[PDB]
Every structure is written in structure tokens, then in C-alpha cells.
Amino acid sequence: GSMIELEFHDVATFDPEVAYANFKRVHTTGLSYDHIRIFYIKGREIKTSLAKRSEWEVTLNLGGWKITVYNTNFPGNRNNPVPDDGLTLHRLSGFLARYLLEKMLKVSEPEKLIIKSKIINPLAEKNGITWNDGEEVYLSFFPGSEMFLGTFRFYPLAIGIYKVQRKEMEPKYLEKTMRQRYMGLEAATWTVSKLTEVQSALTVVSSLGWKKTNVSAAARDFLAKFGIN
Amino acid sequence: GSMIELEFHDVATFDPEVAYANFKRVHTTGLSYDHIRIFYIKGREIKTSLAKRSEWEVTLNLGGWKITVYNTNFPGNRNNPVPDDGLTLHRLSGFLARYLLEKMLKVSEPEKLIIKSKIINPLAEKNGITWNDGEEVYLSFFPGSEMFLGTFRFYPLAIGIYKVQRKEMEPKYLEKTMRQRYMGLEAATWTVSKLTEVQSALTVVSSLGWKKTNVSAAARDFLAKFGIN
Amino acid sequence: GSMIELEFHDVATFDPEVAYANFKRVHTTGLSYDHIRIFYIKGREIKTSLAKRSEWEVTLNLGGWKITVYNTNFPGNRNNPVPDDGLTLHRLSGFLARYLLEKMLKVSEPEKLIIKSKIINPLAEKNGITWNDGEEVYLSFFPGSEMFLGTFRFYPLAIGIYKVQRKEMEPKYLEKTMRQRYMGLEAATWTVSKLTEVQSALTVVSSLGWKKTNVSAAARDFLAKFGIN
Amino acid sequence: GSMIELEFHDVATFDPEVAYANFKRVHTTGLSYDHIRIFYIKGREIKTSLAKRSEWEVTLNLGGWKITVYNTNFPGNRNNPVPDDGLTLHRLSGFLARYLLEKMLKVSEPEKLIIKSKIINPLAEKNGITWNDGEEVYLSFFPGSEMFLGTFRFYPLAIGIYKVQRKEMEPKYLEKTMRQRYMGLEAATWTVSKLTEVQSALTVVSSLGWKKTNVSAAARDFLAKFGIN
RNA sequence: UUUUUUUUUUUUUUUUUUUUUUUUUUUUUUUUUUUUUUUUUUUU
């Protein structure tokens, strides 16, 4: 027979605005609102199909649009460094959410209606929140939005906080959010410096009214009459 | 080595009475009460064996009777469109429950006794409910019955509501029921229009007395004397 | 390609004392207390190793002793009829527990000490119960003992009842016990006829003092001083 | 076909200080603080990678350092005797924790700073405890430390007790600790003989302040203001 | 009357967790989308 020897060795950065800058410059040239809605709608499937394949670098063909992404989803590929100028599924989702929010402020009133028609946010909709509830809010439901707490005016965090305190999400999912800048301010500084910003941001989200299930309006009420969620 | 590219593209109906009509016309010619009892009794196994095979279209041989069914049970086959004139295991179960309830009203008093002897409803029996408790009630325990809330006089819904409020079933399983017609009325209209119908329907089901376990009568009581379910 | 057809068909007894009789006659000729202690001690492993193999009929070689058992443990083999004169791992365990209890009453006082030294009951010991606590009690911890509630004077049931009411076991595991005879009496008759028998039987078991963990005597107490089980 | 026979047979020690002695003599010749930090940091991965391979005896190459370990982690390999002079992952972790604590008492004040810089204890750090909180405490977080309750002055036990009573760990994980010596004293003797030692040991650990999550200081407080852990 | 739970011993055997503005992963993903997901009778 035989005897294996397995080896190990010692060990011992990234900001979003520059990674976003670079992305916008290179990639968003040949890109359209149809290409984006594809990405967000099929986000569910794209995550799984990537988690199956073992190939470290994979390309997505979203309609016409095509991007190369580091497949950090596959179990084996996790926890191996990703370049500061690299794209993961997560970062991509965040960038695109920024990209849209920018358009949604600098573009034509009829053009805005093309966005609100085409682009659907699975996670916001499931929880009974639509474009109508606020363009900055709706888009901050997209994962990756927390990279830009500045741009999204603390809603990524507010949405999280509202979910943990109503038992929906676990405390550990707010970890990444808390290691993030606000405008320029670092974690501890803004934690109280801008506490009242977050206070109001939560106030906004708390009014919106989540959706436990994907049901009717009358259903919500009707079922509740016998003791329901 | 290699590097995969995987692609995606955009996206963007069915009523039971017509699907049932068509089914009854074509399929229930060479069919018998023995063929049905087979389907419902071995329903457990039929679901699993279908969930194993990957073949999108499969045929069932229930004694003499033979049907072709779209195998929507297999994990890979889920969420790919099923024709409005197509059969799934679920729809089949519902149709057959309608079919029986129709017979049970338009047939001979000795013929009814052939039904009550032969046809067994696993789910109703497990929960300590028998034919004696009402032919419309017993049959509405079969999955698919919710497609015809009219035909079954709101019992499919009542049974569900009684189960969630006593913690047995999860809230999300009443979703499909709530997207369904009643006679002609749509969800929101009947939700209150026919609220008192459902009120009484629940009253009926609540009297019947479920069975936590598959035990004796004396057992129920005896065990309870030491602090039991 | 292809298209599968899978088929199904209709469907539509055992007493322990005769199955035990037959077993004792044929099998317990070339058998010893060493052979038994093997069976009970390695019961853990014997269950698993049988659950791996797919062979419907398997033989056990317990030291010298050798028996043929229907491998009803393997997932695929479950729920296919077992002859009334057949042996399963469960039945075997029950029979051997009867067999011992019989010896333990009809044999020499020094011979009894050979039993109490050699034969160990994993499940009774884990729960801090030994031979000292009663030969009829200790042996009724062996699975299969419930087949002979008569022989074991309601302890199989008492032990169960004591476990569910202290949250250790789930209610459904008392199902099999309740479909069993007592002397000659059937379920409902003895349920109250002999209620006071069971009352006292529980009284006995409740005094014995279970063991949450496999720890010391001082440990029990010591750890408890900081708020412990 | 075929028909299997599977066989079984009857059945019917170790002190740490001698196993440690032997280890220190033979193995810690060509060994360095860099080699150790590797072992503890990658402990997570080393456990899994060993649990995959089925080879009963495996060697670790921790930087330069190389050891042979009995792979008792692999499911199949569990519960087959390990020599009293043998190494398991667990024992190794304990020995190395002793080894360090010894150095940390008998070495130069600048040399101590090399240790505190290089060697990281994943489990202590996760729970917000650092070298600063006490060299004997920090090191007793390493698994295996309970073999030497003497050397570590009851902290291995105190840490456990503090965790079960605050619901973090399950009661059964204190089993191994309780079957262990203290100086020379056996379980029951020291359980009260040295009760006040453990009392103070717990007092120490209870002051240290655990960390539910891996978050900031301001985060701890900030999140708590909306009802948080 | 088949299975599922739990299977002794200062047996020292496994099972729980495993750091670092680690920016990696883990949670959950739109439409009266009618698609799956839940349970499945009897001295079984």
C-alpha cells in the first residue's frame, strides 16, 4: 500500500469606487437595459449553474452582453484570492445596481419608465416592495448594494437591520455591511456620526410592508382572520 | 484546459374545468374503481419512482388502466412549462377526485357502497377521517381538489386553514388555493363575498377530530392520562 | 430516445408466542451466554452493517452461533412482507430477551451470576440502569421486548411512557407497543382492565434514575452546581 | 446470486504525561514557532482533509516540520484502538498547547513576544479572547488542553462550563474533561477537593467577554440599539 | 406487526467552533408564473 503526505504553509485592500470605475469604463460600452434584466431575473439560476461547474474563470452571456467572472460560487473554489479589479457574481450584482441608480437620476422621464418596466428585482418583489416604494430603496435590495452605502443612503443596512429584528435573517449576514465605508468615513466613525441617517433610513423601510407569502391582498386579510402570517 | 460560456435570455392561462372536460372525454372510457384505488393507495410510491426517473414524459400502468403523465416530479424537470391540456401527477389526483365525487352523486345506492369499500384516501385516513365523515369532505383531502373549490364546496381550503392554525402545515401551502376560482368568482371577489361559506366549511372540518398518531381508541385516551399527544 | 412505463397493482396475522416457540425449538440448541452477549453488545454495528448490504436474506455468525435473518434494515428492502416464522433483527433481539428472562427464573443461583457478568444491555446501561434494578426491568430495555408485554409485566410500555413524558422519545415510537396483547387480552381490553398494573410498572421505572450523560457520580452533582443536565 | 455471512466476536489505560514526555523527546527536536502557528491556523482545513482520506496512518507536512498521525477523523476509521504512544489530531493539538505554555514560562521576555505575534488560536480569537487575557487561558482554548487540567489550572473545564450554561455548547462535550486527572487526583476526589479552584477559574473566564459575532466595537453597541446579539 | 429514535465500561475514540476592513463564502430570488416543495390508510 501507501501513505499520503499533505502540506500547509503560513499567510500574514479593495475599495469599491475604483473597482466600479474600472468596470463602468471597460464593460458598460456595449450594454442595455434588456441585458441587465436578464442578469437579475435569472440570478437564481446563474448562481446554481456557476456553483456546479468547477472552472475558476467563467464567462456569462446575458443576451448579447458577455462578461468574464471568477467562479467563487463552486464549493472548491471558495476562499482563494480574487483580484481587486476582478468580478464575482456578487460584485457584479452590486455594480449593476449602482449603474442603474446613476441612470435613474441623470436620465429622461420617459427613459425612466423603460427601466421600471424592464428591470425586475426578485428579492424586493418577493418581499412586496416595488419601484414605486423608491428607486434608491428598490435597488438597494440587490446584493452588492452594501459596497456603496454612500450611493444608496444606508438602505442596504436598514433593510438588513429590519430583517434580523423580525427574525427573517440571521445576525451574521450584517457582518460585511459593517466593514464598509460611508462617503469616506470608516466603520466606527459613521456608526454614530451618521446614526440619525440610519435611523430615518430604517423608518422609511419599516413603513413599506413586507410580504410573508406571495398571495393576494384580500388573502392577506382573509387568512389572517383565522390566525395567520 | 478549457473555459465555459453559459447563456441566458428574457421571458415576459389554464383553467381546470376545460382540462377536466378534455380528460374525462378521452381517458375515462376504459376505467374502473379498481384502477383508481390503485392510483391513490400507491400514490406515495408513484411520486418517488417518478422523482427518480429523468424522462420528461412517462406513462403509468395502474392495473389495466394506462395514462401518460409529464414527470414534473424529477428535480431537473421542475419549472418547465406544462401544456394546458397536459397531465401532471397532481392534476391527475385532482381530476380523479372530481370524477369520483360526480359518480358519488349520480349513481345507485349499492354502487356507492362499491366506491366506499374500494377507494381509500391515504391522507384523510391518516388524519382519522373516513367516508362516513362526508363524501365531499373525504374526497377533498386528495391533492388537486383545490382546483375545483366550487365542486368541493370550500373544503380543500377549510382543511388547509384548519391545519396551519394547528401548526401542522406551513402557511405557504395555501398559496395555490388562493389563486383559484369559486364557481366563476375570482380570488378577491369570493374572499369576502363567500366568506360565510368558508366559515361553515371550517366549522364542519373542525368537528371531525384529527388523529395525531395511527393508534387505537383506548390508546388515545390511555396515553393521554400521562401527558400525551 | 425512449419512454418508460412503470406498473402497479392492488393489495387487500403474526403472534409472538408461536414464532418464539418455533425459534426456541430449532435454533437455541447450540447456543451459549457468550453468543448472546456478542449479539447485544455489537447490536449497534450489526444494525449498520446489515443496513449497508442489499441482500434480502443474510446470516449472522455470532462467535460460534450462526443465524439467518431477513435484512429488513437496508432501505430498499423495507416494507416487503416477512414470514410469520421469519426472523428480523428486531424480533431476534426480543426473542433473546425472553429466552434470558426465562433462564433467569428457572436456573441456579451461581448460574444467574454468569448471566449478570456476561450479558450487557447497552440501552439500559446508557440510561444508568443495571441488572441490580430488576432482571425483568433490565431485559425489557432490549428492543423486541414489547412483543411479550405479558412476560415482561408492562415494563416495555412503562419505559416508553416515561421517556416520551420526559421529552427523550417521540410519541410515535409507542405505536407498536399499543397493538400488542397482554397475556391473552387485546389492546382496548387491557388498556383499562390492567391500567393499575401499568400504573405500578411506571412507578417502578420512575424511581430508577436515568443518566442524561455517561459521567461520574460526583460529576452529576458537581456540574449541576452551575446549572446543568 | 449470493448470500452473505457476516461475523462478530467478544471484547472485555493511557495517561497524557507519558505520551507527552515521549512526544517532546522524539519529535520537538526540529521544530519552530512558525511550524506551530501553521498547525493551529490551518487546523480547520487539516481536520477536513484528514476526514476525507481513508488511509489509517497519515503524515502532516507543516512547513518544514513533518509528523505521522493516526487518521481517526475519517468516519470509517473511528473507534479502532489508538496506541498509548500514538498521535491523533486531537492529542497533537493538546501536546502543542502544553509545549507552548511551558516555553511561555521558561523563556526570555523578547522571545515571548515572538510567540504572541506568531501563534494564533482560532477558537479563542473567534470568542474575543486574546493573549492579553492570560497565557494559560488563551492556550487552554486549544482542543486537547483538557488532558492536562493540572498544567492549565482548570481553565479547559471552566471554559466548557461557561459555554454550556450560556447555551453555546451541548452538555455532552464535557464528558471527556470529567474523566481526567488533576495533578494526581482522580475525577471524584478533585470534583470537590479542588472545587474552589474551578470556582475561581470560572470567575476569571466569566469576566473576559465573549464575541457572538466577528464585528467591530461600535458595531457591537450600534446593532444592539435595535435589539441584537 | 416492516421500518424510523437511542445501542455498555477514568472504553480516553469521534461528534460541536476554527482568527485577521480575512472584503471570499454561507441566507432568500419576479409575474390566477397554476410548476414543484409538505403527509401518503389498515391484528400495515
PDB file of N, CA and C (backbone and C1' of nucleotides) in Angstrom, chain C residues 13 44 47 72 78 91 163 173 176 179 181 214, chain E residues 1-9 42-44:
ATOM      1  N   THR C  13     -52.194 -11.046  12.164  1.00  0.00           N
ATOM      2  CA  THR C  13     -51.649 -12.103  11.295  1.00  0.00           C
ATOM      3  C   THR C  13     -50.592 -12.965  11.996  1.00  0.00           C
ATOM      4  N   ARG C  44     -25.300  -2.380  17.798  1.00  0.00           N
ATOM      5  CA  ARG C  44     -25.062  -1.120  17.084  1.00  0.00           C
ATOM      6  C   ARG C  44     -24.514  -1.360  15.681  1.00  0.00           C
ATOM      7  N   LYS C  47     -26.591  -3.618  13.162  1.00  0.00           N
ATOM      8  CA  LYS C  47     -27.670  -2.892  12.503  1.00  0.00           C
ATOM      9  C   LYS C  47     -27.154  -2.158  11.271  1.00  0.00           C
ATOM     10  N   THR C  72     -34.131  -6.610   6.762  1.00  0.00           N
ATOM     11  CA  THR C  72     -35.191  -5.627   6.649  1.00  0.00           C
ATOM     12  C   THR C  72     -34.674  -4.217   6.997  1.00  0.00           C
ATOM     13  N   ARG C  78     -36.943  -2.519   2.976  1.00  0.00           N
ATOM     14  CA  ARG C  78     -38.034  -2.224   3.905  1.00  0.00           C
ATOM     15  C   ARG C  78     -39.393  -2.431   3.252  1.00  0.00           C
ATOM     16  N   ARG C  91     -36.999  -8.826  15.945  1.00  0.00           N
ATOM     17  CA  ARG C  91     -37.618  -9.984  16.552  1.00  0.00           C
ATOM     18  C   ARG C  91     -36.585 -10.807  17.305  1.00  0.00           C
ATOM     19  N   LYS C 163     -40.236   7.866  28.949  1.00  0.00           N
ATOM     20  CA  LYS C 163     -39.325   8.575  28.053  1.00  0.00           C
ATOM     21  C   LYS C 163     -40.012   9.681  27.253  1.00  0.00           C
ATOM     22  N   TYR C 173     -43.158   6.326  18.640  1.00  0.00           N
ATOM     23  CA  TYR C 173     -42.488   5.062  18.972  1.00  0.00           C
ATOM     24  C   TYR C 173     -43.277   4.138  19.909  1.00  0.00           C
ATOM     25  N   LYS C 176     -46.225   0.694  18.089  1.00  0.00           N
ATOM     26  CA  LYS C 176     -46.105  -0.768  18.009  1.00  0.00           C
ATOM     27  C   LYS C 176     -46.489  -1.460  19.300  1.00  0.00           C
ATOM     28  N   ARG C 179     -50.318  -2.072  19.860  1.00  0.00           N
ATOM     29  CA  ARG C 179     -51.024  -3.015  19.011  1.00  0.00           C
ATOM     30  C   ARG C 179     -50.710  -4.435  19.463  1.00  0.00           C
ATOM     31  N   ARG C 181     -50.724  -7.728  22.539  1.00  0.00           N
ATOM     32  CA  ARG C 181     -51.517  -8.469  23.509  1.00  0.00           C
ATOM     33  C   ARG C 181     -50.919  -8.339  24.909  1.00  0.00           C
ATOM     34  N   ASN C 214     -22.967  10.003  30.150  1.00  0.00           N
ATOM     35  CA  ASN C 214     -22.141   8.911  30.651  1.00  0.00           C
ATOM     36  C   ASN C 214     -20.989   9.475  31.492  1.00  0.00           C
TER      37      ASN C 214
ATOM     38  P     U E   1     -46.010  -5.967   8.992  1.00  0.00           P
ATOM     39  O5'   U E   1     -46.172  -7.517   9.341  1.00  0.00           O
ATOM     40  C5'   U E   1     -45.387  -8.129  10.375  1.00  0.00           C
ATOM     41  C4'   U E   1     -45.355  -7.201  11.562  1.00  0.00           C
ATOM     42  C3'   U E   1     -44.670  -7.702  12.820  1.00  0.00           C
ATOM     43  O3'   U E   1     -43.264  -7.965  12.658  1.00  0.00           O
ATOM     44  C1'   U E   1     -46.607  -6.382  13.333  1.00  0.00           C
ATOM     45  P     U E   2     -42.159  -6.807  12.557  1.00  0.00           P
ATOM     46  O5'   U E   2     -42.324  -6.271  11.063  1.00  0.00           O
ATOM     47  C5'   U E   2     -41.581  -6.842   9.956  1.00  0.00           C
ATOM     48  C4'   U E   2     -41.003  -5.774   9.045  1.00  0.00           C
ATOM     49  C3'   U E   2     -40.303  -4.602   9.725  1.00  0.00           C
ATOM     50  O3'   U E   2     -38.914  -4.898   9.903  1.00  0.00           O
ATOM     51  C1'   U E   2     -41.890  -3.810   8.112  1.00  0.00           C
ATOM     52  P     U E   3     -38.123  -4.368  11.204  1.00  0.00           P
ATOM     53  O5'   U E   3     -37.849  -2.839  10.858  1.00  0.00           O
ATOM     54  C5'   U E   3     -37.052  -2.481   9.706  1.00  0.00           C
ATOM     55  C4'   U E   3     -37.395  -1.091   9.222  1.00  0.00           C
ATOM     56  C3'   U E   3     -36.975   0.034  10.146  1.00  0.00           C
ATOM     57  O3'   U E   3     -35.587   0.258   9.925  1.00  0.00           O
ATOM     58  C1'   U E   3     -39.133   0.456   9.181  1.00  0.00           C
ATOM     59  P     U E   4     -34.628   0.646  11.152  1.00  0.00           P
ATOM     60  O5'   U E   4     -34.971   2.184  11.378  1.00  0.00           O
ATOM     61  C5'   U E   4     -34.786   3.167  10.339  1.00  0.00           C
ATOM     62  C4'   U E   4     -35.554   4.429  10.661  1.00  0.00           C
ATOM     63  C3'   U E   4     -35.221   5.063  12.003  1.00  0.00           C
ATOM     64  O3'   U E   4     -34.082   5.901  11.853  1.00  0.00           O
ATOM     65  C1'   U E   4     -37.576   5.169  11.516  1.00  0.00           C
ATOM     66  P     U E   5     -32.756   5.634  12.718  1.00  0.00           P
ATOM     67  O5'   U E   5     -33.156   6.203  14.151  1.00  0.00           O
ATOM     68  C5'   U E   5     -34.074   7.309  14.282  1.00  0.00           C
ATOM     69  C4'   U E   5     -33.997   7.894  15.670  1.00  0.00           C
ATOM     70  C3'   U E   5     -32.990   7.222  16.594  1.00  0.00           C
ATOM     71  O3'   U E   5     -31.727   7.842  16.357  1.00  0.00           O
ATOM     72  C1'   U E   5     -35.126   7.270  17.637  1.00  0.00           C
ATOM     73  P     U E   6     -30.451   7.432  17.224  1.00  0.00           P
ATOM     74  O5'   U E   6     -30.697   8.305  18.533  1.00  0.00           O
ATOM     75  C5'   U E   6     -29.711   8.473  19.560  1.00  0.00           C
ATOM     76  C4'   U E   6     -29.933   7.459  20.653  1.00  0.00           C
ATOM     77  C3'   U E   6     -29.092   6.195  20.541  1.00  0.00           C
ATOM     78  O3'   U E   6     -27.790   6.400  21.081  1.00  0.00           O
ATOM     79  C1'   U E   6     -31.289   5.791  21.449  1.00  0.00           C
ATOM     80  P     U E   7     -27.558   6.383  22.674  1.00  0.00           P
ATOM     81  O5'   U E   7     -27.179   4.861  22.946  1.00  0.00           O
ATOM     82  C5'   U E   7     -26.361   4.173  22.000  1.00  0.00           C
ATOM     83  C4'   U E   7     -26.306   2.721  22.347  1.00  0.00           C
ATOM     84  C3'   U E   7     -25.080   2.022  21.781  1.00  0.00           C
ATOM     85  O3'   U E   7     -24.338   1.482  22.862  1.00  0.00           O
ATOM     86  C1'   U E   7     -27.068   0.798  21.298  1.00  0.00           C
ATOM     87  P     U E   8     -23.113   2.302  23.450  1.00  0.00           P
ATOM     88  O5'   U E   8     -22.926   1.693  24.909  1.00  0.00           O
ATOM     89  C5'   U E   8     -23.667   2.203  26.035  1.00  0.00           C
ATOM     90  C4'   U E   8     -23.300   1.459  27.300  1.00  0.00           C
ATOM     91  C3'   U E   8     -21.955   1.803  27.916  1.00  0.00           C
ATOM     92  O3'   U E   8     -22.006   3.015  28.658  1.00  0.00           O
ATOM     93  C1'   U E   8     -22.203  -0.546  27.863  1.00  0.00           C
ATOM     94  P     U E   9     -20.685   3.905  28.841  1.00  0.00           P
ATOM     95  O5'   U E   9     -19.695   2.945  29.643  1.00  0.00           O
ATOM     96  C5'   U E   9     -19.332   3.205  31.017  1.00  0.00           C
ATOM     97  C4'   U E   9     -18.174   2.329  31.436  1.00  0.00           C
ATOM     98  C3'   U E   9     -16.784   2.777  30.993  1.00  0.00           C
ATOM     99  O3'   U E   9     -16.172   3.778  31.816  1.00  0.00           O
ATOM    100  C1'   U E   9     -17.059   0.463  30.545  1.00  0.00           C
ATOM    101  P     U E  42     -52.545   3.170   9.110  1.00  0.00           P
ATOM    102  O5'   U E  42     -53.923   2.407   9.354  1.00  0.00           O
ATOM    103  C5'   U E  42     -53.989   1.247  10.206  1.00  0.00           C
ATOM    104  C4'   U E  42     -55.005   0.246   9.697  1.00  0.00           C
ATOM    105  C3'   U E  42     -54.569  -1.213   9.730  1.00  0.00           C
ATOM    106  O3'   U E  42     -54.677  -1.826  11.018  1.00  0.00           O
ATOM    107  C1'   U E  42     -55.421  -0.731   7.594  1.00  0.00           C
ATOM    108  P     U E  43     -53.400  -1.931  12.005  1.00  0.00           P
ATOM    109  O5'   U E  43     -53.337  -3.485  12.382  1.00  0.00           O
ATOM    110  C5'   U E  43     -53.997  -4.044  13.547  1.00  0.00           C
ATOM    111  C4'   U E  43     -53.478  -5.432  13.882  1.00  0.00           C
ATOM    112  C3'   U E  43     -53.238  -6.366  12.703  1.00  0.00           C
ATOM    113  O3'   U E  43     -51.927  -6.174  12.195  1.00  0.00           O
ATOM    114  C1'   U E  43     -54.428  -7.516  14.412  1.00  0.00           C
ATOM    115  P     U E  44     -51.484  -6.892  10.839  1.00  0.00           P
ATOM    116  O5'   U E  44     -51.941  -5.853   9.721  1.00  0.00           O
ATOM    117  C5'   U E  44     -51.634  -4.449   9.827  1.00  0.00           C
ATOM    118  C4'   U E  44     -50.982  -3.970   8.552  1.00  0.00           C
ATOM    119  C3'   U E  44     -49.659  -4.639   8.180  1.00  0.00           C
ATOM    120  O3'   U E  44     -49.867  -5.535   7.094  1.00  0.00           O
ATOM    121  C1'   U E  44     -49.642  -2.281   7.742  1.00  0.00           C
TER     122        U E  44
END
